Design a protein around this ligand. Structure first.
Ligand code: CLA
Ligand code: CLA
Ligand code: CLA
Ligand code: CLA
Ligand code: CLA
Ligand code: CLA
Ligand SMILES: CCCCCCCCCCCCCCCC(=O)OC[C@H](COP(=O)(O)OC[C@@H](O)CO)OC(=O)CCCCCCCCCCCCCCC
Ligand SMILES: CCCCCCCCCCCCCCCC(=O)OC[C@H](COP(=O)(O)OC[C@@H](O)CO)OC(=O)CCCCCCCCCCCCCCC
Ligand SMILES: CC1=C(/C=C/C(C)=C\C=C\C(C)=C\C=C\C=C(C)\C=C\C=C(C)\C=C\C2=C(C)C(=O)CCC2(C)C)C(C)(C)CCC1
Ligand SMILES: CC1=C(/C=C/C(C)=C\C=C\C(C)=C\C=C\C=C(C)\C=C/C=C(C)/C=C/C2=C(C)CCCC2(C)C)C(C)(C)CCC1
Ligand SMILES: CC1=C(/C=C/C(C)=C\C=C\C(C)=C\C=C\C=C(C)\C=C\C=C(C)\C=C\C2=C(C)CCCC2(C)C)C(C)(C)CCC1
Ligand code: SF4
Ligand code: SF4
Ligand SMILES: [Ca+2]
Ligand SMILES: [Ca+2]
Ligand SMILES: [Cl-]
Lengths: 731, 140, 38, 31, 80, 148, 157
């Protein structure tokens, strides 16, 4: 007998319980474990899945564009960006009452509407889009793009167009085409767009599909680019009195490098952005010529890795080409670690050095962007370490990687784990001790005995970039330094933007920033300790010397040998998720409190109260909640009704996750058995019988479900608080 | 063939057989008793075994085996002649325990060796060496 | 509920469809598929 | 301006195409 | 069902068979230890996976190993 | 939930002052009827409002109540670690630390073992109850001592 | 032989049967769609199939006369559409029943229950009831269009 679903697992299809359903959903994407999977079919299915995913991204982007065009006020928003709030789309909910309708007819809309909080308006405006028809045609074109990628994914599964395994394992050519073509040519095309459209539109010159062939973006054509006199393109950059969208203060420059911020929009100059894209395009195209393909000339990754032997290391990087090229979990972990690092980098660089016009004034959108991308980065990092452990479980070859870097990392894993334990205990012990000392000191009416230690190293680093507030006179803060008298066109604007305490560039830090950066260090150290200990013991330990035989994820090994709960590397991932969420909470709390202080001009509150934790408990959480929890009350409803309701929703989901996390299966299986008895013996209901035998959720499933609720609640409740507080205060 | 023995004296309970016994399968424990005794029911509550033969139907095999351990470990004249069978809805009966008339705790000739690995635990093949197959280190 | 945007009659029937018809149909199809053969 | 009434119910026909192609891709990936 | 394997590091102390609550294991003759016997898993279709046989095992890391596999009515321990 | 109901109902519809007119002015002005019917009411007009005494207790004779408030919060969060994890991870971490002590011959003769599953549960629930009950103890005491 | 990119193959693997397997006549979508219509959906008794078919048909048969019949420009527009639809469903029920009376006089087959005298009479009964109900419910919706609009807009909140 067989129950068909899931077709890819008879071990599940023959499960006569509800687990068959759940696990069928949980293992569908794990193509490696499908019955009779081959490596070539694995790669081809992954290829088509990638095509489908790219189509999904294009469809979601088209949805953003289309809803902004249709139900937005983009053209009205351009007339007065600093006062008109951007709207994401209209509401249509039959549950609404008169109070809710009146509350959500906002931002000059004739119908209920949600206000945008993702800064996509500033994006589209700085890019050069000025009408609704442009956004509309963009949405339609992206529909077509999703269609193209869907047809490509369909075609690459046909026997007439199936890429073979050797084609997928061609690392040299793929790296060449991605570095040179995917990365370089695309930054080149974006520079061309900024030069032809974005910058001319910033100066009031309409450039559309009806005139871009006729009007050159520079009074000189391509000969200054052809010959070599490139300074013609620097011409007269936009003056410090250029008003955006008009010709006042406008120039003819298409490639500058003055640095600093546009005085009105408070963002990077579009000319410097296009110049950056051109330079990066050249760099990436140069990079994309390193590895040989079919013309003999070029490098081979395997020989480069093999050559890097050494004395104390041993085999060095020998055979690592095959090690990484034959394991998709290795490639995925590398990609996830890199992408999480650079996503956190985007988050850190968008609030400090913004690049979209007037988005520095829109504080809620910036808070939400920073929080969003830091959360994405945390997820990506946890996933990277999970895939490293999965590689260790499934793909690691001890003989082909003998005595190399990998084998040595595994060979002294106790040293690495123990020293991570030491650094984590160190950081946590001392940071919590200092916070508790400051709390107990402020409590007894003697706030003068707080341990305030100046963040001297980071202030010195700021000064090295030209920060003269702390009087360090080191490097770019010292005019007599060699590095400051080089004649670089970016020094004046950079110093003017970093020494004007009016933006978010290199914010002044006090001892509270020192304490919270040590808290962040504790969080990173502890989460990484969890993940590394899980990946290094994934193949085995002294409780399960054969943990690799059981797989990356299994319930446990029983109560024997002392008890083996949460033994697999998957359990290490599930543990590390809590600490990652806590680290992002510390990040976002710090960022949001300091930025609320900065935006209100009352930086004294944060600088004086972030030292003891009661300061965080009453001046940050309790205080900024006052607006949110009044979105609806016994007196009516304001525009924060949804955010208050979602705040409470996240609380509920979080506690419901606690439910699955604290109480463990067997109790529930017995309870379900009593309920099964009940159903079989209650008349009329006996006419009906389940098709799948009801059973309690499995152990690993219970961890996953509790953690899913925990994370849903975490994100939703903090997003509600962030949005409601920053929007009711308007920064 | 036909299972024989008097049912134990029991007033009934809600923990006994369900629809599985008639739709899927059931199990039976038989045992001889030196006197009318009181034993504990694996499904909850106390019952009285008759002197002589006793036949009892249970829903799961582990329940019959729990009853067997109780018979052989909790009574002055130890009951160890108990037999456990599996009954199907077609009335078929499959003798189960003890498999070869001798308890599996002590060695007995005639038994084959299954699941026995000639190698050591730590001598299992690495998973990468058997990947993209339908086998695991403990199976090849 | 109303809408000054064009084709405001579209959400009128499209919200029930996305919220009632589409979910009922997809859940029924997936339920039949889960419990197929036997 | 404001998007045309006829314009909103023109993108849906174009969306019928990625719907068809996503249906085809899903059914092919199920194989 | 679950897999129950036995390895050559078996000493034949019969404790895992005594600990089994579903009669999955047997003591068959062998010639690799003093007790001249080894454990076997003939009735694996009745294994639930309670790991008691591993708990009652004395060898430095178990000589008998239980790997949880395809679940069924018997392995899930269902009386319904 | 029982003691929260007791506190809010007493402060709202019972406890209060009385002016020489027969008229009674309650502590929190009878807000129980219109606010204790939603969860947002308990969050705002009971927890957020009445915890203002506990959080602003620093610099007075009740700063100890704010200290113990934060302490109960911390002990709840600490219990969560014993409640959400398993013994095997901690035993592996202890194995690594035991190797580290073996490197310098500081290995104790009494081998360090992770808390048993039952003991992990007992510790988790003990810390959970302690933290929560101490939190509400500090909150209740500060509030009912700052209402006259 | 690396040539079967053709989408139009022989119908049901029989090239000598008067039919062709095409993306309309025999594709996965059309097959799973028509095969799960109430007329072919497996596990359905004839009366339920008739009920579903009648519901659909009687529901949509209100419109033509409602918007285009002679009573369209009277104060009984919806009532006139309803009356026309009810008469049409009655005539169609008579036609269905007569067809069943004539086609199943002989030996009752054992293939599918719908293709018998009893099964076809059950299908006709289901169709009659479903059609009258669908016409009356579409009429009732049209006559109470204001409450439907107020419901879907939340006007009554
Ligand atoms: C120049 C030729 C070329 C180009 C154009 C591509 C293009 C692509 N290939 Mg392909 N490929 C090629 C040749 C090429 N390939 C060759 C020669 C081989 C080997 C024989 C392969 C084999 C191959 C495989 C096996 C796979 C791909 C995949 C992909 C896609 C990568 C994933 C993606 O879409 O994210 C796009 C990534 C970028 C645009 C780069 C972004 C830069 C980073 C992220 C920083 C972001 C910068 C900036 C701030 C972001 C803008 C933010 C904005 C919101 C403002 C991509 C579109 C994958 C795929 O998806 O399958 C379809 C995949 O599985 N390729
Ligand atoms: C960046 C893209 C990416 C890709 C393509 C993969 C790929 C894969 N992952 Mg991975 N992973 C990622 C990111 C990614 N992951 C991230 C960001 C995390 C951190 C949360 C993880 C953490 C992780 C773990 C712990 C596991 C996987 C697993 C898997 C495999 C099965 C997926 C599955 O069917 O689960 C089904 C998906 C769901 C049920 C979705 C439910 C959750 C919704 C979104 C709420 C699969 C090949 C599993 C595996 O097979 O292990 C070997 C597994 O255990 N991943
Ligand atoms: C506020 C809650 C809380 C606390 C205090 C801890 C504490 C700790 N965790 Mg933990 N964790 C938590 C939440 C918490 N966790 C949650 C919810 C999870 C998800 C289940 C995890 C999962 C987790 C994992 C997976 C790991 C940790 C680790 C650690 C230890 C790392 C050392 C450190 O961080 O610095 C120092 C320690 C502290 C700041 C806390 C102790 C400080 C106290 C107050 C000192 C005083 C002791 C006191 C006087 C003793 C006498 C008491 C007497 C009155 C009875 C540490 C002891 C990592 C580890 O073990 O590192 C080696 C580890 O791998 N945690
Ligand atoms: C992922 C993109 C996306 C998203 C998230 C939304 C979001 C929303 N839309 Mg919109 N829509 C989109 C794209 C999108 N739209 C596009 C491209 C069009 C033009 C064809 C429209 C045209 C449209 C109309 C006419 C209306 C909405 C409406 C709505 C709201 C209710 C949903 C609904 O009833 O309409 C359903 C949506 C459609 C019929 C269009 C199909 C959506 C795209 C083409 C496919 C998305 C597939 C994508 C992969 C998601 C799959 C799920 C995922 C798990 C894989 C909702 C907030 C209603 C509204 O205004 O609310 C007040 C409504 O009246 N949309
Ligand atoms: C010359 C031929 C002709 C003519 C003149 C008409 C004329 C008409 N048709 Mg018809 N139609 C025709 C042919 C024709 N049709 C054909 C060939 C078909 C295909 C078989 C249809 C199928 C069709 C359908 C499905 C419907 C109409 C409807 C209508 C009326 C809509 C105008 C109106 O009153 O606004 C008002 C329109 C509405 C209020 C729409 C009804 C909204 C309901 C509540 C559905 C909500 C959707 C959602 C799934 C709710 C389900 C709840 C569930 C989960 C419990 C109208 C009188 C509609 C109708 O009968 O009005 C009730 C309608 O539902 N037509
Ligand atoms: C020779 C007799 C005859 C008669 C008297 C009529 C009379 C009529 N024709 Mg028709 N016509 C005829 C022949 C006839 N026609 C022929 C041969 C043709 C082909 C060229 C046409 C083609 C024609 C068309 C195309 C149309 C008409 C229409 C109409 C009706 C217009 C008014 C109306 O609203 O109808 C409403 C009345 C009915 C539909 C009949 C219902 C009568 C009762 C109340 C039915 C209730 C059922 C009840 C339970 C039965 C009980 C039975 C019991 C007594 C035993 C009208 C009653 C129009 C129409 O149908 O209007 C809607 C229309 O569209 N005629
Ligand atoms: C800044 C981070 C804050 C603290 C994090 C922890 C730092 C870890 C330091 C502990 C001591 C390491 C013991 C090495 C053990 C050791 O000496 O191995 C022996 C090894 C000898 O290597 P070979 O001469 O064989 O090199 C040939 C190679 O091609 C093959 O590996 O020494 C080195 O590799 C050079 C110096 C070690 C470099 C170790 C890297 C540590 C990372 C430090 C931060 C990296 C930043 C990189 C930015 C580009
Ligand atoms: C343009 C797109 C084309 C698709 C059609 C669109 C509307 C038409 C709907 C008609 C459906 C036909 C129903 C009968 C179809 C039918 O009943 O088939 C038959 C089958 C069960 O019936 P049998 O196997 O007994 O029938 C077999 C034969 O009789 C076939 O004729 O059902 C299924 O196969 C399971 C359904 C697939 C489940 C699909 C998964 C969907 C979940 C994911 C959804 C993603 C949404 C993302 C966007 C939000
Ligand atoms: C003959 C030829 C040449 C002339 C070429 C000519 C004559 C024109 C070249 C035009 C080019 C190369 C246009 C490239 C256009 C790419 C476009 C237009 C857009 C891509 C957009 C994407 C992918 C997604 C965009 C999104 C949408 C749609 C939005 O609306 C919001 C933003 C975002 C989400 C990003 C020259 C002499 C040069 C070289 C020799 C050959
Ligand atoms: C487990 C595993 C894995 C994973 C891993 C991981 C996850 C890692 C990590 C991590 C990370 C994520 C890292 C990162 C890092 C860092 C670095 C690498 C640094 C850099 C540096 C530098 C050198 C800088 C410099 C500078 C400065 C200082 C400033 C200014 C500018 C400049 C540039 C000058 C794999 C799969 C792979 C394999 C298997 C196992
Ligand atoms: C889907 C689709 C399509 C389309 C179609 C159309 C165009 C239409 C249909 C439509 C219809 C056709 C609908 C319907 C509706 C109906 C209803 C809704 C019904 C009803 C009924 C009721 C509700 C009941 C009633 C009653 C009775 C019977 C009893 C007594 C009396 C009364 C009245 C109560 C196509 C194929 C193209 C493609 C694929 C998809
Ligand atoms: S408990 Fe272990 S050593 Fe003893 S007989 Fe069983 S398998 Fe062999
Ligand atoms: S897991 Fe349980 S049932 Fe299976 S062999 Fe071990 S003790 Fe017996
Ligand atoms: Ca333009
Ligand atoms: Ca007329
Ligand atoms: Cl409220």
């Amino acid at each position: 007998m067989a129950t068909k679903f899931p077709k890819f697992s008879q071990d599940l299809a023959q499960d006569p319980t509800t687990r068959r359903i759940w696990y069928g959903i949980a293992t569908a994407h794990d193509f490696e474990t499908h019955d009779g999977m081959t490596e070539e079919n694995l790669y081809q299915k992954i290829f088509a899945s990638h095509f489908g995913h790219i189509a999904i991204i294009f469809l979601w982007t088209s949805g953003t564009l289309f809803h902004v065009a249709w139900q937005g006020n983009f053209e009205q928003w351009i007339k007065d960006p600093l006062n008109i709030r951007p709207i994401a789309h209209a509401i249509w909910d039959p549950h609404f009452g008169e109070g809710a309708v009146n509350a959500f007819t906002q931002a000059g809309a004739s119908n209920p509407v949600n206000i945008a909080y993702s800064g996509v308006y500033h994006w589209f405006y700085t890019i050069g889009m000025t009408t609704n028809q442009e956004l509309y045609s963009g949405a339609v074109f992206l529909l077509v793009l999703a269609s193209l990628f869907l047809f490509a994914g369909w075609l690459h599964l046909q026997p007439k167009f199936r890429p073979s395994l050797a084609w997928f394992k061609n690392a040299e050519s793929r790296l060449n085409h991605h570095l040179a073509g995917l990365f370089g040519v695309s930054s080149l095309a974006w520079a061309g767009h900024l030069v032809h459209v974005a910058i001319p539109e910033a100066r009031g010159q309409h450039v559309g599909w009806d005139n871009f062939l006729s009007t050159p973006p520079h009074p000189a054509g391509l000969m200054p680019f052809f010959t070599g006199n490139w300074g013609v393109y620097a011409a007269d950059p936009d003056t410090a009195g250029h008003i955006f969208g008009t010709s006042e203060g406008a120039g003819t420059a298409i490639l500058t490098f003055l640095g600093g911020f546009h005085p009105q929009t408070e963002s990077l100059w579009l000319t410097d952005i296009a110049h950056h894209h051109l330079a990066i395009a050249v760099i990436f195209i140069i990079a994309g010529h390193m590895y040989r393909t079919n013309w003999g000339i070029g490098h081979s990754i395997k020989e480069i890795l093999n050559a890097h032997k050494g004395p104390l290391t041993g085999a060095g990087h020998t055979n690592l080409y095959d090690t990484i090229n034959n394991s998709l979990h290795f490639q995925l972990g590398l990609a996830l670690a890199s992408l999480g690092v650079i996503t956190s980098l985007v988050a850190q660089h968008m609030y400090s050095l913004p690049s979209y016009a007037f988005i520095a004034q829109d504080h809620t959108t910036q808070a939400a962007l920073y929080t969003h991308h830091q959360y994405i980065a945390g997820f990506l990092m946890v996933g990277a370490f999970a895939h490293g452990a999965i590689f260790f479980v499934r793909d690691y070859d001890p003989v082909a990687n003998k005595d190399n870097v990998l084998a040595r990392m595994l060979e002294h894993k106790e040293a690495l784990i123990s020293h991570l334990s030491w650094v984590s205990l160190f950081l946590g012990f001392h940071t919590l001790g200092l916070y508790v000392h400051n709390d107990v000191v402020v409590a007894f009416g003697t706030p003068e005995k707080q341990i305030l230690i100046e963040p001297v190293f980071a202030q010195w680093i700021q000064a090295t970039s030209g920060k003269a507030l702390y009087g360090f006179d080191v490097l770019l803060s010292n005019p007599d330094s060699i590095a400051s008298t080089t004649g670089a066109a970016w020094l004046p604007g950079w110093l003017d933007a970093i020494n004007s305490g009016t933006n978010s560039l290199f914010l002044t830090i006090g001892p509270g920033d020192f304490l919270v950066h040590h808290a962040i260090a504790l969080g990173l150290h502890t989460t990484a300790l969890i993940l590394i200990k899980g990946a290094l013991d994934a193949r085995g330990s002294k409780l399960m010397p054969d943990k690799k035989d059981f797989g990356y994820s299994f319930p446990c090994d029983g109560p024997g040998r002392g008890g083996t709960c949460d033994i697999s590397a998957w359990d290490a991932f599930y543990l590390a998720m809590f600490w990652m969420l806590n680290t992002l909470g510390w990040l976002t709390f710090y960022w949001h409190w300091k930025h609320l202080g900065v935006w209100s001009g009352n930086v004294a509150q944060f600088n004086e109260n972030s030292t003891y934790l009661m300061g965080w408990f009453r001046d940050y959480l309790w205080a900024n909640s006052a607006q949110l929890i009044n979105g609806y009350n016994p007196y009516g409803v304001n525009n924060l009704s949804v955010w208050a309701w979602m705040f409470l929703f996240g609380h509920l989901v979080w506690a419901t996750g606690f439910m699955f996390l604290i109480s463990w299966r067997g109790y529930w299986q017995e309870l379900i058995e009593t309920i099964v008895w009940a159903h079989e013996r209650t008349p009329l209901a006996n006419l009906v019988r389940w098709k799948d035998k009801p059973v309690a959720l499995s152990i690993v499933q219970a961890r996953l479900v509790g953690l899913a609720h925990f994370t849903v609640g975490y994100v939703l409740t903090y997003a509600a608080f962030l949005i409601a507080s920053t929007a009711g205060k308007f920064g | 063939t036909e299972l024989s023995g008097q049912p134990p004296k029991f007033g009934g309970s809600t923990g006994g057989l369900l629809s599985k016994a008639n739709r899927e399968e059931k199990y039976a424990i038989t045992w001889t008793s030196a006197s009318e005794q009181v034993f504990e029911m694996p499904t909850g509550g106390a019952a009285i075994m008759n002197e002589g033969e006793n036949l009892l139907y249970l829903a799961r095999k582990e329940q019959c085996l729990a009853l067997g351990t109780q018979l052989r470990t909790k009574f002055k004249p130890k009951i160890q002649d108990y037999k456990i069978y599996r009954v199907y809805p077609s009335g078929e009966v499959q003798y189960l325990h003890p498999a070869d008339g001798v308890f599996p705790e002590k060695v007995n000739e005639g038994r084959e060796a299954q699941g026995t690995k000639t190698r050591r635990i730590g001598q299992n093949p690495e998973p990468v060496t058997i990947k993209f197959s339908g086998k695991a280190p403990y199976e090849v | 509920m109303d809408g000054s945007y064009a084709a405001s009659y579209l959400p009128w029937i499209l919200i029930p469809m996305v919220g009632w018809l589409f979910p009922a149909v997809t859940m029924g199809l997936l339920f039949i598929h889960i419990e197929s053969e036997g | 301006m404001a998007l045309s009434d006829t314009q909103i119910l023109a993108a849906l026909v174009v969306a019928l195409l990625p719907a068809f192609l996503a249906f085809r891709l899903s059914t092919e990936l199920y194989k | 069902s679950h897999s129950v394997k036995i390895y050559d590091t078996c000493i034949g102390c019969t404790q895992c068979v005594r600990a089994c609550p579903l009669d999955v294991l047997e003591m068959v003759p062998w010639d690799g230890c003093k007790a001249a016997q080894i454990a076997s898993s003939p009735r694996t279709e009745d294994c639930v996976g309670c790991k008691r046989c591993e708990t009652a095992c004395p060898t430095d890391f178990l000589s008998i190993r239980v790997y949880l596999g395809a679940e069924t009515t018997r392995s899930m321990g269902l009386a319904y | 939930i029982v003691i929260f109901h007791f506190s809010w109902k007493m402060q709202s519809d019972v406890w209060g002052t009385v002016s020489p007119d027969g008229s009674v002015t309650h502590v929190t002005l009878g807000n129980f009827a219109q606010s204790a019917i939603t969860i947002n009411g308990w969050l705002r007009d009971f927890l957020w409002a009445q915890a203002a005494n506990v959080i602003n207790s620093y610099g007075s004779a009740l700063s100890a109540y704010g200290i113990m408030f934060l302490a109960g919060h911390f002990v709840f969060a600490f219990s969560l670690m014993f409640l959400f994890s398993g013994r095997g991870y901690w035993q592996e971490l202890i194995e690594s630390i035991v190797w580290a002590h073996n490197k310098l011959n500081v290995a104790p003769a009494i081998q360090p073992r992770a808390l048993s599953i039952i003991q992990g549960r007992a510790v988790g629930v003990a810390h959970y109850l302690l933290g929560g009950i101490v939190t509400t103890w500090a909150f209740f005491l500060a509030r009912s001592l700052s209402i006259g | 032989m690396a040539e079967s990119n053709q989408v139009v193959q022989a119908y049901n693997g029989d090239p000598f049967v008067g039919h062709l397997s095409t993306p309309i006549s025999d594709s996965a979508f059309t097959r799973t769609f028509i095969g799960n219509l109430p007329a072919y959906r497996k596990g359905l008794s004839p009366i339920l199939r008739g009920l579903e078919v009648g519901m659909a048909h009687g529901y949509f048969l209100i419109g033509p006369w409602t918007l285009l019949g002679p009573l369209r420009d009277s104060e009984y527009q919806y009532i006139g559409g309803l009356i026309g639809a009810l008469a049409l469903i009655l005539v169609a029920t008579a036609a269905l029943s007569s067809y069943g009376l004539v086609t199943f006089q002989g030996e009752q087959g054992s293939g599918d229950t719908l293709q018998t005298a009893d099964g076809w009479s059950q299908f006709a009964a289901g169709f009659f009831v479903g059609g009258m109900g669908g016409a009356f419910v579409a009429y009732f919706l049209l006559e109470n269009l204001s409450v439907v609009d107020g419901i879907f807009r939340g006007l009554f909140n």
